[PDB]
Amino acid sequence: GVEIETISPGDGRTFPKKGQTCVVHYTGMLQNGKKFDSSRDRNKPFKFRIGKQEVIKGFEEGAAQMSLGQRAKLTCTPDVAYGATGHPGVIPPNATLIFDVELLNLE
């Protein structure tokens, strides 16, 4: 599943709701240490809708349990990420993924 380790606490009150758009900054790396992406380096926060299966299960389950302003390390086992298939040309089969996510806003 998804394991969450807080980097900085959020407000402890405002969490993503049904129908809301999450606005985050993230950095992703393979558990071996290779960084594969960062919304921070492109200076553009990442947006996705809660409950719309837009992102991998671990990323959305991690964000759903975060409050506004929280930053956390999410460790995603392959069954909540890209599983046996991987993501073509970027994420191999059976990859555990680490995401550093900050919940910036809810729209």
Ligand SMILES: CO[C@H]1C[C@@H]2CC[C@@H](C)[C@@](O)(O2)C(=O)C(=O)N2CCCC[C@H]2C(=O)O[C@H]([C@H](C)C[C@@H]2CC[C@@H](O)[C@H](OC)C2)CC(=O)[C@H](C)/C=C(\C)[C@@H](O)[C@@H](OC)C(=O)[C@H](C)C[C@H](C)/C=C/C=C/C=C/1C
């Ligand atoms: C260039 O960078 C890519 C993101 C890259 C791709 C490669 C991976 C390593 C990665 O680097 O992100 C990465 O860090 C990663 O693993 N991510 C991104 C951050 C959230 C977690 C994860 C993810 O789920 O990616 C996603 C993963 C790769 C695929 C999805 C996984 C869940 C599954 O249910 C979905 O089935 C459909 C497919 C990619 C996304 O987060 C993008 C935003 C979402 C989609 C494409 C779909 O949800 C699509 O469904 C119709 C939509 O509704 C979108 C909004 C429609 C519009 C037009 C498309 C926009 C595309 C934007 C693409 C972007 C910024």
Ligand SMILES: [Cl-]
């Ligand atoms: Cl790297």
Ligand SMILES: [Cl-]
């Ligand atoms: Cl920015």
Ligand SMILES: [Cl-]
């Ligand atoms: Cl923002």
